[PDB]
Structure 1
Amino acid sequence: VQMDTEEVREFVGHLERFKELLREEVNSLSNHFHNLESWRDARRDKFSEVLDNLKSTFNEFDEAAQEQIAWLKERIR
């Protein structure tokens, strides 16, 4: 066999935990932020967006990670 399936299984598991953790952590952070009633200048607005470009980047990572996980699981046979 070429690939080492045990090594690959372990990485897949880790990729899975990492991508579930980050989505839950960024939702958490975002729900907290948008729930601040008293910070509402143009700075809050500048961060709202910085948070949004983080959220977009994670979900693109998420999508790319899911497709790699699929390929690797297939390779495993």
Structure 2
Amino acid sequence: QMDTEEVREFVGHLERFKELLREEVNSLSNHFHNLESWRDARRDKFSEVLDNLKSTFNEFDEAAQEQIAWLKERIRVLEEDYLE
């Protein structure tokens, strides 16, 4: 008894969120790796912070994709049931 249009828009949001953040963290990571003139203990510490963010992203990407997969199928089931 979900409102499947309501849920469809959230699914789309979650997909775009994952896509955008992947591209933005990849861009930031590439820039950081290319940054030649910052080399000290604080740079090393920040490298770990960025590693942790990537790990966090991956964990969330997995959790989100599993919800997306389920929600898209549930929307189909419910809409089919509603029409039939």
TM > 0.5 fold call: yes
Identity across the alignment (%) = 100
Map Cα deviations across residues 7-34 of structure 1 (whole Å, 9 max, x no partner).
Answer: 0100000100000000000000000001
How many pairs were matched up?
76
Q: Secondary structure at the match of 1:34?
A: helix
Q: Which has the higher helix share?
A: 2
Map Cα deviations across residues 32-69 of structure 1 (whole Å, 9 max, x no partner).
Answer: 00110110101100000000000100111111100000
Structure 2 Cα separation of the partners of residues 63 and 32 of structure 1: 25
Unaligned runs of 5+ in 2: 77-84
Alignment of 1:49-60 (within 5 A): 49-60=48-59
TM-score (norm 1): 0.96
Q: RMSD across aligned C-alpha pairs, in angstroms?
A: 0.6
Deviation at 1:74, TM superposition (A): 1.2
Match of 1:47 in 2: 46
TM-score (norm 2): 0.88
